[PDB]
């Protein structure tokens, strides 16, 4: 992608390599964030379409008391919540 | 059509049922048949297990029936088989020993023969090309050919008799002449064959 150009480190023989220093700086902040939301008792929704890992991510999330959505994603899901999910509903506080 | 597609046809031949024990794939097959809990059709009233039933005669019988008269068609046929029979007995006793060995006294063999001999090999279908209808040579499937023979016999001995002449008689004549290939029916078969030979070039047109 064109917007990875900063996060990259450099090309090794055609294969691109991320900057792990930046990975840590970022991931720290991400995990911190995740945590501060969990502590504040709010919904967390993991999402992936990737098949290899589907099971993992549900198996992970079920054990967190957090929710996963790994599946076909119906269209108006978050946008039109009350029609899709139920008459009135709470929405994910954080999506991951 | 009061039969759904679930109902398969009856197989009515008795020789099949009485003597299964030497046939493996057929044992397997009729096992599949009734075991399948197969809904099977009430056998028709025309089809019987009678030792005397010749399906060809039945078809030809039907095609002669106008309206709903089975009775009448049956009778006309019966009288035709009969008429040929007696006519061939008359030819027999008035002949010489050699020809006594020759002559066919079986009206049935005479019938299957006189139909085998009247059936055309090729036939024409019209093809539309560039505005004109060309009559083109088409190889034919057997049943269509049988039909053409029977249809022809019936139409011929229906149309061209003088009114004082009964159907079974004339029909018998046409049967015995078609036996020896000298009959008008075969003239018809031959005009088919000739028309096919004249148009043979156009057998390119046909695409199937």
């Amino acid at each position: 992608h064109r917007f990875m150009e900063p996060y990259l480190f450099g090309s090794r023989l055609g294969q691109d390599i991320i900057d792990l220093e930046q990975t840590a700086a970022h991931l720290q902040l991400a995990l911190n964030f995740t945590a501060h939301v969990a502590y504040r008792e709010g919904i967390i929704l993991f999402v992936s379409r990737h098949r290899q890992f589907a099971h993992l991510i549900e198996t992970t999330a079920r054990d967190c008391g957090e929710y996963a959505h790994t599946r076909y994603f119906k269209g108006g899901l978050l946008t039109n919540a009350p029609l899709l999910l139920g008459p009135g509903v709470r929405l994910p506080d954080l999506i991951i | 059509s009061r039969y759904g597609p679930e109902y398969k046809d009856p197989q009515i031949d008795k020789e099949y049922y009485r003597k299964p024990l030497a046939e493996q794939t057929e044992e397997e097959k009729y096992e599949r048949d009734f075991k399948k809990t197969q809904l099977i059709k009430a056998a028709p009233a025309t089809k019987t297990s009678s030792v005397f039933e010749d399906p060809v005669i039945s078809k030809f019988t039907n095609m002669m029936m106008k309206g709903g008269n089975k009775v009448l068609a049956r009778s006309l046929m019966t009288q035709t088989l009969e008429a040929v029979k007696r006519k061939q007995f008359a030819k027999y006793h008035a002949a010489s020993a050699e020809e006594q060995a020759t002559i066919e006294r079986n009206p049935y063999t005479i019938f299957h023969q006189a139909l085998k001999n009247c059936e055309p090999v090729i036939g024409l279908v019209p093809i539309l090309k560039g505005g004109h209808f060309y009559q083109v040579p088409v190889p034919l499937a057997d049943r269509r050919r049988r039909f053409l023979a029977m249809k022809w016999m019936i139409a011929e001995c229906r149309e061209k008799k003088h009114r004082r002449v009964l159907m079974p008689e004339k029909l018998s004549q046409e049967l015995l002449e078609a036996f020896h290939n000298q009959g008008p029916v075969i003239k018809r078969k031959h005009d088919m064959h000739k028309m096919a030979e004249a148009n043979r070039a156009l057998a390119h047109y046909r695409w199937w």
Binding site: - | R200, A201, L202, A203, H204
Partner: protein
Amino acid sequence: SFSIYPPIPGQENSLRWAGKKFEEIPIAHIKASYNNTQIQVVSAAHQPLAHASCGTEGFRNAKKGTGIAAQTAGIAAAAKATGKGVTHVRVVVKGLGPGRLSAIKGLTMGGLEVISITDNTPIPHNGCRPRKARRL
């Protein structure tokens, strides 16, 4: 290495049909035109032994186009040729038309034995301009 097709005009190749050199075997010219076909069977010496046309075979203005007609002409041609006693034929097809294959088959089925097919179909290297295309 069996049956390399193009036998050389040098004498290095001994292969005989009816004990003859490939040079001595009769040439059957086939000309397949869209409306016509004609075969002419000629000696290696160029003395014509047989001629059959789709028209000479008694077909008419359209119908003489067909492959039927082609094989028809082929048969009788090989009849006239067989009469003068030619066993084997090297064939050349000229033009590209309906009765190419049909006529070639017609020589075989007509009881004439075929060794070679070669295609001489005139292919302009951009000489004379063709007639204009048609609808226009």
